[PDB]
Amino acid sequence: EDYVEKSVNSETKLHKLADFAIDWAHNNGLILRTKQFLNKSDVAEFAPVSLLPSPFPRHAFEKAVAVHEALQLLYFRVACDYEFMMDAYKDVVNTDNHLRQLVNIIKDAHKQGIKQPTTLLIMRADYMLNTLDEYELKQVEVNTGAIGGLGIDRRTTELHRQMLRKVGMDTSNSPANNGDSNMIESLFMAWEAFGNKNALFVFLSHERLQYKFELRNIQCQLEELSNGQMKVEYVSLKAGYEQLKLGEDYSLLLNGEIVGVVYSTISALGHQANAREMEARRTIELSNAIKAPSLAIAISSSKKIQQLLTTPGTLERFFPSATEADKVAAIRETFTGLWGLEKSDDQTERRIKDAIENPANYVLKSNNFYDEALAEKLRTMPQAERASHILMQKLIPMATKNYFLRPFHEPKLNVVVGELGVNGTLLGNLRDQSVRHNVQSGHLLRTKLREGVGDSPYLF
Amino acid sequence: ELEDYVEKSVNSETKLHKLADFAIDWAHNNGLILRTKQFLNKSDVAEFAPVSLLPSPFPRHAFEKAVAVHEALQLLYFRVACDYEFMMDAYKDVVNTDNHLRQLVNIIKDAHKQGIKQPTTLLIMRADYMLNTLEYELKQVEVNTGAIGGLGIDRRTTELHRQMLRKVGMDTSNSPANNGDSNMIESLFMAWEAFGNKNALFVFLSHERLQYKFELRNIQCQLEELSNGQMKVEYVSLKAGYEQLKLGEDYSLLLNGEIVGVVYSTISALGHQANAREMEARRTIELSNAIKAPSLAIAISSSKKIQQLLTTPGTLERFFPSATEADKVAAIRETFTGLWGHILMQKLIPMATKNYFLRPFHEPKLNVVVGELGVNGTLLGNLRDQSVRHNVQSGHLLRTKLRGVGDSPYLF
Ligand SMILES: Nc1ncnc2c1ncn2[C@@H]1O[C@H](COP(=O)(O)OP(=O)(O)O)[C@@H](O)[C@H]1O
Ligand SMILES: Nc1ncnc2c1ncn2[C@@H]1O[C@H](COP(=O)(O)OP(=O)(O)O)[C@@H](O)[C@H]1O
Ligand SMILES: [Mg+2]
Ligand SMILES: [Mg+2]
Ligand SMILES: [Mg+2]
Ligand SMILES: [Mg+2]
Ligand SMILES: [Mg+2]
């Protein structure tokens, strides 16, 4: 399919469609704070997006959506398996102080005993298409720890349905995208589970952020759902050092008030936190607040754990019963090759040799090098760094054409590639590993120049 | 009274910023926005519409009076617009000193000589009132008929103010419903159907550089929804209209060769000082069979001179001759203050209150302020026989200045 080129047949049509889309974005809240004023909402720009929804195979979309609940159950169980988590991090700990401080928080939480059984896992699974013209769906990453912008994603779908109508195309191949509703319902469900209507709901978030309008949408809808009863607050880890305390009953206290939910948009793995920020993370973690997500759930989505999960028998540790072989198989077929660099087997040294000699087949990742950069990193890597890196099979994605809409850039025709993101939530119990609500809801396309922007799939 | 609840409800700089911060984010999330001053030709960035932090106190009696009289006020000005002899007489002297008004009246003269080609027209009116101090009486300051918009801004302002009221623990039932934007759209769609050709364009006669572009886009999307994707919309200015608008040999209005069924003006006939090319576009529009929202005669019926003439004894009774319509005449007349034949007007002394202004990049503070109540509506009429298909009041606003910004009433 190259319907985008077929549907946009002049510069006059390009500007008429772009102009409409930009105004639509502002009118429907598909917006971010400007880079110039990340601390201020006085002005806002539209979220960067494709002009039309990028073609995506229907089979691959259906596969990715279908496996998500089982994928969420997997990572929930991984997070709950203390012995597995400590073993996966035993080497990485010695070379990386950020990950050491985080694992020590989890160690301290485990030895004090868990004070709050209810937790909310929030996951995005990312996939690319890999070429065989037929394509297989393969998983690139899993993200737990800080998931947001689901309102941006829905609005992007809605925009694309409008754009499809404008160029005379059927909108039934644009799938429904209501993740933001699940986010809010799940967050509200978590707030009720705390069992104290005077307990605060806290957005653990940066002061300077593009996504502030998105968080405000969650706030308004949470307040509506609680009939004005839920008090909401915003705090960063920097400010949390002074403002968050652990009460003598293990309550989380924000300026002395009980907090019932901490919804993190500050990634535990992604955000390089200083010593004051880690002490706030610790305080949160040792408290009886429902965490969305808990630290153990946040750090379960590292590249090392992604790699370990591909080793035979490892998936079966979390799904031991023959009744769950269908989940194991469905997850396994979305994996491509991943390998660790830690040990001195002959299997690993041959893998390293293969990648040095044939680097176009690989991507080298830390907790990203390509081609001769990859071969050189492998040649010159110190003994210590081996454990903080994994080898992954290189995926060759489907290429299409599309226009990008970005603040203050003329749109033009680019060759582009998509990355499919599938979102969901799981509300669970850490003590007995039961599940109250495990759903897939919401998706996106992230589209880049091949040689990026928000996008949504048009299924074929 | 509830006359300084704003001061009572906002008792620190900390509370002021927490409320302001919430309101600004709410505005962007709900489309209470305008294009930036820096980039009036571009929608890439947008700022929030300037508004009061809380809804300004306004007497319930005065609001109810202004809303109640509106349909009769609309009927009055419709009938004024349709009375060619009255309009020419009101402008006979003014014409000789003012070239802008001369060109406009000459368009109406040329339309009258050719015979009017489209009987259906849509009057869009805002009546402005100030409170006058004695207790307060409601008095009319102005009537506006040639370019009315921003009713979506007004509704959203009401919605914002209901949110702010909840945040400071105040009852929202004294904030009246404000759904003028829906009437605007329904009335505009009604006008488009009355043309009787689903392939006919709907045209926003509008500036290219304007803060209100997002508002017009909202109307576009809702008109397209209401037509089930059938209505084609376009935008054109009078500058661009010189070359792009033509009068067809059957009196069709042609925008780049396509038939136009409705011309909705947001370029004021009295307010916008138009050049010679722009007046020829205005003429083309006016001589065509497009339904005009509003027609030029309706737009120029709302001059200060006509406002003044309407206060002279027996002049209201020209348009409402029957004893049966003396109740309308009396209800309209009690909202008039003194006017005499520019023109002399009696000075009104408005009610003062306190409020905070939210404006892009300026810290809010407590100001002494005065309000001006705007009441909106539409009338879909027939110029040939003077009949009326739809005459409703819908929508209002407060415009609040330092003794400005968008505001909404909190009734007491
Ligand atoms: N196996 C792979 N083959 C090809 N490209 C990849 C592969 N893995 C990652 N990439 C590219 O690199 C990008 C970033 O790396 P990723 O591992 O997803 O980490 P993160 O999203 O946390 O930065 C991906 O979005 C994708 O475009
Ligand atoms: N009779 C009056 N007494 C006091 N102020 C007036 C009077 N008439 C007009 N004003 C003030 O002048 C402003 C603008 O005048 P107006 O006649 O409404 O023209 P326009 O709104 O078309 O510019 C009003 O908003 C009001 O503040
Ligand atoms: Mg990624
Ligand atoms: Mg990850
Ligand atoms: Mg099964
Ligand atoms: Mg005025
Ligand atoms: Mg006037």
Residue numbers in the entry:
A (entry chain A): 29 to 160, 167 to 401, 408 to 491, 502 to 510
B (entry chain C): 27 to 160, 168 to 374, 429 to 490, 502 to 510
Passage from the reporting paper:
Glutathione, the tri-peptide γ-L-glutamyl-cysteinyl-glycine, is the main low molecular weight thiol antioxidant in both plant and animal cells, often present at millimolar concentrations in vivo. It is synthesised in a two-step, ATP-dependent, process: glutamate-cysteine ligase (GCL) catalyses the formation of γ-glutamylcysteine (γ-EC) from glutamate and cysteine, followed by the addition of glycine by glutathione synthetase (GS) to form glutathione. Cyst nematodes have exploited a series of gene gain events to redeploy glutathione synthetase-like enzymes during parasitism, within the syncytial feeding cell formed in the host root. The most recent expansion has been coupled with a diversification of structure and biochemical function that has given rise to enzymes that are introduced into the host cell, and likely possess novel substrate specificities.
To explore the catalytic capacity of nematode GS-like genes, the G. pallida representative of Clade 1 (Gpa-gss1), one representative from Clade 2 (Gpa-gss5) and a number from Clade 3 (Gpa-gss12, Gpa-gss17, Gpa-gss22, Gpa-gss24 and Gpa-gss30) were heterologously expressed in, and their proteins purified from, bacteria. Remarkably, each stage of the evolutionary process that gave rise to GS-like effectors has witnessed at least a 10-fold reduction in apparent glutathione synthetic rate, such that Clade 3 GS-like proteins have not retained canonical enzyme activity. In contrast, none of the Clade 3 GS-like effectors accepted any of the tested terminal amino acid substrates in combination with the γ-EC backbone. Comparison between Gpa-GSS22-open and–closed reveals a functioning ATP grasp fold. Residues in the ATP binding pocket of St-GSS1 are highly conserved in sequence and position in the Gpa-GSS22 structure (13/15 residues), and similarly conserved in sequence across G. pallida Clade 3 (structure guided alignment, ~12/15, n = 24). In contrast, there is considerably more variation in the di-peptide binding pocket of G. pallida GS-like effectors, yet, this variation is not evenly distributed around the pocket. However, the glutamate of the di-peptide is exclusively coordinated by interactions with charged side chains of residues in the binding pocket (R, E, 2xQ, N, and Y). All six of these positions are substituted in Gpa-GSS22 and Gpa-GSS30, thus suggesting that the lack of canonical activity is because γ-EC is not accepted despite the potential for cysteine to be accommodated. Variability in the glutamate portion of the di-peptide binding pocket is ubiquitous in G. pallida Clade 3 GS: of the 24 GS-like effectors there are 21 different amino acid compositions in these 6 positions, not one of which is canonical.
